[PDB]
């Protein structure tokens, strides 16, 4: 982290450094810094390189493509992606999808919550047995 501070305002020098080190923290810092400058199509590249599936899924749920987020969450098992994907469907009003995907992340307290709100009775059993005491 210290090097980014030093090389701030030396942005090309930073870019060289971060593209060389290949540390998956400098890569994620550069990804942050190519999402906070409105160049979202290289944030995907560097986040892809820096194995940050929660972030990729987030961006994919921002740019309307949600089939892509579904893809990046089917195979990589990163639960955080399953959470944010489920919330994306939640705002999208897909209910079965946003319930099953909370289920994926082993986050059953949100699952039971949206389940109760919808009224899915089967959900109560399916996520109460699995639920903690």
């Amino acid at each position: 982290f210290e090097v980014p501070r030093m090389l701030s305002e030396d942005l090309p020098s930073l870019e060289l450094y971060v593209n060389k080190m290949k540390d998956k923290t400098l890569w994620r810092w550069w990804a942050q810094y190519l999402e906070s400058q409105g160049e979202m199509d290289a944030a995907l590249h560097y986040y892809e390189l820096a194995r940050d599936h929660f972030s990729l899924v987030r961006i994919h749920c921002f740019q309307g493509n949600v089939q892509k987020a579904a893809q990046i969450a089917n195979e990589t098992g990163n639960l955080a992606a399953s959470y944010h994907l489920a919330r994306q469907y939640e705002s999208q009003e897909e209910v079965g999808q946003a319930v099953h995907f909370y289920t994926r992340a082993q986050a059953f307290k949100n699952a039971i919550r949206l389940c109760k709100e919808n009224g899915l009775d089967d959900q109560l059993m399916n996520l109460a047995l699995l639920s903690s005491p």
Binding site: P4, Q32, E35, F54, L79
Partner: protein, 321 residues
């Protein structure tokens, strides 16, 4: 020592701690904290301080030095909270981007400023706290707290990289309606009252003085009130009863009251044997709170699951998941 000469100092401290060492463990751990505080790793500084806190309380298991180690435990716990809070402010004023929501930074900055009145643990520069607070209060709409933040700033030496923004904000904040949005006003949960955002006495009500119970994710205000047990009552006794179904005058729940609650509405925060279990009634049982069983911090349930999933541990203690 093999790890030590192999520079694996974190594991080495863990080893001495597990090895009954109480001279090597503490010395290496304090040295590690000083290194962390020296750099910008304030979150690690907080975690190491937390380890010191629980380990020193474990040492206080010895009746010889109980009095002289509960003080150390309390001091290190307060330092742990402060540094974990200050890490977010440190990140926010350095990175060209921002990670946290504005609400969370606002709440963190207010808690810090109301818990760090006149003494600054090493590294915690309160110019940054007030700067973040002023920006965030002006953004959210608490236009009277921002006036305080700037007035307080006017008495501190400002680094040159903050002067332009602060000395222009102090001027452009007089244009705002001079009003604090009600959506941010803190509310007590023991006495109904609406404490000023800037409460001079610290984190405490005015009518009563029940200190606010803050969570550990967004440093938010919580709906938990801390009742204390009666005189001739034990923790086992109290839990038994529960399951069966102007200075400060602390509330003293008594037996027939403890038989009028349920585990749905109390959080027990079972400390180790040397201390006594402190309790927390809740006033909105419909809402939820989860208590990390290691560090006994409290979070909103929904927040705690996202946080565990994101980190793979508690964020405060990095205990297993």
């Amino acid at each position: 020592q093999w790890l030590a000469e192999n520079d694996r100092f974190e594991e080495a401290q863990k080893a001495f701690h597990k090895a009954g060492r109480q001279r090597e463990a503490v010395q290496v751990l304090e040295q590690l904290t000083n290194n962390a505080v020296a750099e910008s790793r304030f979150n690690d500084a907080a975690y190491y301080y937390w380890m010191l806190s629980m380990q020193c309380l474990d040492i206080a298991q010895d009746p010889a030095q109980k009095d002289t180690m509960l003080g150390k435990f309390y001091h290190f716990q307060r330092l742990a909270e402060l540094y974990h809070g200050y890490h977010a402010i440190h990140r926010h004023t350095e990175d060209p981007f921002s990670v946290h929501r504005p609400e969370t930074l606002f709440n963190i900055s207010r808690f810090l400023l109301h818990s760090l009145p006149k003494d600054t643990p090493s590294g915690i520069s309160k110019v940054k706290i007030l700067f973040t607070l002023a920006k965030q209060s002006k953004a959210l709409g608490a236009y009277r707290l921002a006036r305080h933040a700037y007035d307080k700033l006017r008495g501190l030496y400002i680094p040159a990289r903050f002067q332009k923004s602060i000395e222009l904000g102090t001027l452009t904040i007089r244009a705002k309606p001079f009003h604090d949005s009600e959506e941010l006003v803190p509310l007590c949960y023991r006495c109904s009252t609406n404490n000023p955002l800037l409460n001079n006495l610290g984190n405490v009500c005015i009518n009563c003085r029940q200190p606010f119970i803050f969570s550990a994710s967004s440093y938010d205000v919580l709906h938990l009130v801390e009742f204390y047990l009666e005189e001739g009552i034990t923790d086992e006794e109290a839990i038994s009863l529960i399951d069966l179904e102007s200075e400060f005058v602390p509330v003293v729940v008594s037996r027939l009251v403890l038989r009028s609650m349920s585990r749905r509405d109390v959080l027990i925060k079972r400390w180790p044997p040397p201390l006594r279990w402190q309790y927390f009634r809740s006033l909105l049982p419909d809402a939820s709170i989860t208590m990390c069983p290691s560090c006994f911090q409290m979070f909103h349930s929904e927040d705690y699951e996202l946080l565990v999933l994101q980190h793979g541990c508690c964020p405060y203690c990095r205990r297993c998941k």
